[PDB]
Design a binder for these strands. Structure first.
Ligand SMILES: [Mg+2]
Ligand SMILES: [Mg+2]
Ligand SMILES: [Mg+2]
Ligand SMILES: [Mg+2]
Ligand SMILES: [Mg+2]
Ligand SMILES: [Mg+2]
Ligand SMILES: [Mg+2]
Ligand SMILES: [Mg+2]
Ligand SMILES: [Mg+2]
Ligand SMILES: [Mg+2]
Ligand SMILES: [Mg+2]
Ligand SMILES: [Mg+2]
Ligand SMILES: [Mg+2]
Ligand SMILES: [Mg+2]
Ligand SMILES: [Mg+2]
Ligand SMILES: [Mg+2]
Ligand SMILES: [Mg+2]
Ligand SMILES: [Mg+2]
Ligand SMILES: [Mg+2]
Ligand SMILES: [Mg+2]
Ligand SMILES: [Mg+2]
Ligand SMILES: [Mg+2]
Ligand SMILES: [Mg+2]
Ligand SMILES: [Mg+2]
Ligand SMILES: [Mg+2]
Ligand SMILES: [Mg+2]
Ligand SMILES: [Mg+2]
Ligand SMILES: [Mg+2]
Ligand SMILES: [Mg+2]
Ligand SMILES: [Mg+2]
Ligand SMILES: [Mg+2]
Ligand SMILES: [Mg+2]
Ligand SMILES: [Mg+2]
Ligand SMILES: [Mg+2]
Ligand SMILES: [Mg+2]
Ligand SMILES: [Mg+2]
Ligand SMILES: [Mg+2]
Lengths: 6, 63, 136, 386
RNA sequence: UUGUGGCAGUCAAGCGUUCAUAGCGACAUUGCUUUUUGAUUCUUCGAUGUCGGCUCUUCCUAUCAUACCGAAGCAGAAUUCGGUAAGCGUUGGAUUGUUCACCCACUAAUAGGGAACGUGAGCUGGGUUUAGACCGUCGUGAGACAGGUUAGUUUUACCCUACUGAUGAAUGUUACCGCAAUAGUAAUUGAACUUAGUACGAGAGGAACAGUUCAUUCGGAUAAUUGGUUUUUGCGGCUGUCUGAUCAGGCAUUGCCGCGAAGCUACCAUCCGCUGGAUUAUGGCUGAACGCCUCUAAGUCAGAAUCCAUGCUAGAACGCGGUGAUU
RNA sequence: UUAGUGACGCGCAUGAAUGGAUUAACGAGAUUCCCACUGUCCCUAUCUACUAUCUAGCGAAACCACAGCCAAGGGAACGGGC
RNA sequence: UACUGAUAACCGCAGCAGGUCUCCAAGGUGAACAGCCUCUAGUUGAUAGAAUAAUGUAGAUAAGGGAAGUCGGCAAAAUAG
């Protein structure tokens, strides 16, 4: 679960 | 061509064979093999190594 | 080599990449020389320029006189400590890396050289050859 | 986007595909251009690589710092027993290439060469050329008209030769057979030379001479499946690389949506056929001769063979070619020596080479001695001796 | 799409001692490009893994260098402008997460760019951009801040294709020697000596062709030598323990140390890296058009790191040949 | 040397129990430099064991419209199909 | 009131390298229930065989240089009683 596309 | 002599063992050195070490005091030591070079660097004395010409001379073996 | 290099030099194995500190063999008042470049060196990705016996390098002085420190100057390598092959077939090496300070055309800043020098460098720099006692 | 820093392609693209050679004997893909004036001679020869050794010689290169000074150089030795001529075949030109029309053979083929036509010789009636040999014994009928056909046609002529493998220390027993072009003149004279030399032997002294430049054509040492690093010389990825560092990191861009042929990939290393050119001959030595390893300056009767023999090969009881440097192939491999294709003057191919000394010390270790007599003199009597 | 950015043209008031165009070029104007940034919102929100760097390949040319040339306010040397040309190369570092930038130094040169702003089941994760925490400012407060700071899990290929290598049925069988369509292709650059303190130049300064010796980068092999590697657990030595001692050995996840053949291997070692034709630019021949002149219109000479061959690497597994034996 | 340290200060927007300025000792805290050390790197090579590999036995899963060679074109403006 | 008390008797969907309270405790080396070897006692269980390609995991060694690597000396080495 990557919190990167933000 | 000249055939040189190992500074540690007394063995004959033919061309292209062995190494040469120039020390800070400008002295030249010729080695026929990494064996004698490594014993030199380990600071061993040839008169106590049983296969060296100097040992055999100092101990009267084949004289 | 280059400007004051009278003659050519057969290849001999490189031992001194940039970053190497080698002792100073002459009486200019410097103790060591930190190599930052090599004259005549090629360009390859990630390859460090490296110097051999006889090469003219760019060097700084890390330990020595203040009037020599904190500045870049030319130097010449006179002892390698890595084995190299002569066309005689013999591999030979010194015990230490050693250079002398010079100008871009090869004139030594000092007057003497402590210890031996390589014949390859003596044949390539005559001012080195004059101020060198033992040449091997 | 553009590569941050420039660097060259890792590897040579004209040496692809880096695949195994179709045979162990590399084939000559080009022979020297023919002058139809000179006598009839072979353009190539067959030998077996024995090993490498060390040479001393006085250099003659005016302008160098080592002029008239002794240098040490590496040479490779090729055991060249005399080849045996069994057959010729004529090639005629067509708009689709050179095409063979006939192959004439000798009457008597030896066992070592008719073993080349069998995969299981121990169980066979051996039944080879047993009707072609009866094609003789009526004076020349089925043979002389084939030779006349080759004369009437066949702009190019090639002789079939085989090796005398039984004269080598190899345990193979099966002779290598090869086509070698003739580069004399008068195709009639070419084929008459062949007919006269049928069943007969040709030595390397009649083909090669000293200080001559030659090409070595051989299949090179095999190393099996190898990774991109040693196969192509690519950069090792750094230490903290997940899933391997001994790799190529990017094998292509998104578009073209394919792996390109020019990208370094793992695979076979070695056992490629290679042609290495401009290797000077430093000695052509005979086997009906002791002191093969002697010179004008040494003058101690010693063969070319080291003490203990050439490692993994044996002795050089036959003739040999000492050729400068390093040639493709490993010991015991069949090598094809070929005359040069162009005239190289070069001020280095014309240097007359006079050897001073040959290393005959053991290659199975750090050899101290060149001859057992030298060993005995240096060491003295031992407990084995009396 | 191209305002903005970048690049290139036309014109020629003037600059350039004189002289518009050697080199520049205002006032104006015609365009190209899409490596800038914007404009837009067509596709994607039941997810196309965003910065940068590392790694690797290819491509473009708007050519930095190298080859060949033309022009100059080109005497020489150095430099500038331009052309054919992308064949070959275009680095090592300090600081910054950086792209970018700036300095040091070498260099023939340190040219610009594209490939889903190439490339995360290729890496990394320094930065951005979850959750913890600190500061400053704002806010009554909870809290906010392209403001700063520190800490913060990077998953799966065994599938298809592609790529690299490796087998293989069927062309009467089997074996040997070959051809060569097609595809690929590679070598590169510099210094020193000499030419010569010569040409040139008042002098200061100061070349070039040929030739020789070496080197740079690249590539293909090789292991005679040097070096490295060591389960040759080959020889010796050392510790602790066990086999009563001795000899000889076991265990210490290869116990440690020195030497160490063989093999593998290193610009850390050595060898090698071909010569012919057709051309570009450009310079010329004859020679009209245009009774002259004109390299050009017909025709033609020489000519580049260019192209095609020579050569080098595979060998079509549905391309071919010759030969041997054929129960 | 966009780093670090020491100084300067009209400080976008420092500041006093929102604690201010110091601070020996301590810190798996953040940072810069130096010595030593090193395969981090120049620049890679080699060895060992377990894997992968081949065999006997055993034997899943993810995923799956149909499937699987490319260039250009157009097209939901980047096709395996047209 | 038997028995296990755990790399198979408990809990983790299971005969799971995890977790789960405690008693007794030989000789040597050595400061030492450290590490290494051994006696008593207990195991000899874990799918095997054949080879030794690439890439890996774990362990290591490397001439000369010596942080030039990298965001960063991460990792490893060096030191060690
Ligand atoms: Mg780098
Ligand atoms: Mg570029
Ligand atoms: Mg890129
Ligand atoms: Mg290699
Ligand atoms: Mg990782
Ligand atoms: Mg040997
Ligand atoms: Mg525009
Ligand atoms: Mg514009
Ligand atoms: Mg949009
Ligand atoms: Mg979306
Ligand atoms: Mg979807
Ligand atoms: Mg994707
Ligand atoms: Mg152009
Ligand atoms: Mg774009
Ligand atoms: Mg990807
Ligand atoms: Mg946070
Ligand atoms: Mg407030
Ligand atoms: Mg924000
Ligand atoms: Mg060795
Ligand atoms: Mg070895
Ligand atoms: Mg004329
Ligand atoms: Mg406050
Ligand atoms: Mg397509
Ligand atoms: Mg699709
Ligand atoms: Mg249709
Ligand atoms: Mg009971
Ligand atoms: Mg009980
Ligand atoms: Mg019980
Ligand atoms: Mg218990
Ligand atoms: Mg118990
Ligand atoms: Mg249970
Ligand atoms: Mg339960
Ligand atoms: Mg005690
Ligand atoms: Mg206790
Ligand atoms: Mg204990
Ligand atoms: Mg198991
Ligand atoms: Mg860097």
């Amino acid at each position: 679960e990557s919190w990167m596309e933000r | 061509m000249k055939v040189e002599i190992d500074s540690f063992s007394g063995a004959k050195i033919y061309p292209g064979r062995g190494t040469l070490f120039v020390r800070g005091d400008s002295k030249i030591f010729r080695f026929q093999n990494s064996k004698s070079a490594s014993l030199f660097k380990q600071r061993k004395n040839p008169r106590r190594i049983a296969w060296t010409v100097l040992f055999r001379k100092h101990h009267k073996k084949g004289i | 080599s280059g400007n004051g290099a009278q003659g050519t030099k057969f290849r001999i194995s490189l031992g001194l990449p940039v970053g190497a500190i080698m002792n100073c063999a002459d009486n200019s008042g410097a103790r060591n020389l930190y190599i930052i470049a090599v004259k005549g060196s090629g360009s390859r990705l990630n390859r460090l320029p490296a110097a051999s016996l006889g090469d003219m390098v760019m060097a700084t002085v890390k330990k020595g006189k203040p009037e020599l420190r904190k500045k870049v100057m030319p130097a010449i390598v006179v002892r390698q400590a890595k084995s190299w092959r002569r066309r005689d077939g013999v591999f030979l090496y010194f015990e230490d890396n050693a250079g002398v300070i010079a100008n871009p055309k090869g004139e030594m800043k000092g007057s003497a050289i402590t210890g031996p020098v390589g014949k390859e460098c003596a044949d390539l720099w005559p001012r080195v050859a004059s101020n060198s006692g033992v040449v091997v | 986007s553009h590569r941050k820093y420039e660097a060259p392609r890792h590897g040579h693209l004209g040496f692809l595909p880096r695949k195994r050679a179709a045979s162990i004997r590399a084939r000559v893909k080009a022979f020297p251009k023919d002058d139809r004036s000179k006598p009839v001679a072979l353009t190539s020869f067959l030998g077996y690589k024995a090993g490498m050794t060390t040479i001393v010689r006085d250099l003659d290169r005016p302008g160098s710092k080592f002029h008239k000074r002794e240098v040490v150089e590496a040479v490779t030795v090729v055991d060249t027993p005399p080849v045996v001529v069994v057959g010729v075949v004529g090639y005629v030109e067509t708009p689709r290439g050179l095409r063979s029309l006939t192959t004439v053979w000798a009457e008597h083929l030896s066992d070592e060469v008719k073993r080349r036509f069998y995969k299981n010789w121990y169980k066979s009636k051996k039944k080879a050329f047993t009707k072609y040999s009866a094609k003789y014994a009526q004076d020349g009928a089925g043979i002389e008209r084939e030779l006349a056909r080759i004369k009437k046609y066949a702009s190019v002529v090639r002789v079939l030769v085989h090796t005398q493998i039984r004269k080598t220390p190899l345990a193979q027993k099966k002779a290598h057979l090869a086509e070698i072009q003739l580069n004399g003149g008068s195709i009639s004279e070419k084929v008459d030379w062949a007919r006269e030399h049928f069943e007969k032997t040709v030595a390397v002294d009649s083909v090669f001479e000293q200080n001559e430049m030659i090409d070595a054509i051989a299949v090179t040492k095999g190393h099996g499946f190898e990774g991109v690093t040693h196969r192509w010389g690519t950069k090792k990825l750094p230490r903290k690389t997940h899933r391997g560092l001994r790799k190529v990191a990017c094998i292509g861009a998104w578009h073209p949506a394919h792996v390109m042929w020019s990208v370094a990939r793992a695979g076979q290393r070695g056992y490629h056929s290679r042609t290495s050119i401009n290797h000077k001959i430093y000695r052509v030595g005979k086997g009906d001769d002791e002191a093969n390893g002697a010179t004008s300056f040494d003058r101690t009767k010693k063969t070319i063979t080291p003490m203990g023999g050439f490692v993994h090969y044996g002795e050089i009881k036959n003739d040999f070619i000492m050729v400068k440097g390093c040639i493709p192939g490993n010991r015991k491999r069949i090598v094809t020596l070929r005359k040069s294709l162009y005239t190289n003057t070069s001020r280095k191919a014309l240097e007359e080479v006079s050897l001073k000394w040959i290393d005959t010390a053991s290659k199975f270790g750090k050899g101290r001695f060149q001859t057992p007599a030298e060993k005995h003199a240096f060491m003295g009597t031992l407990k084995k001796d009396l």
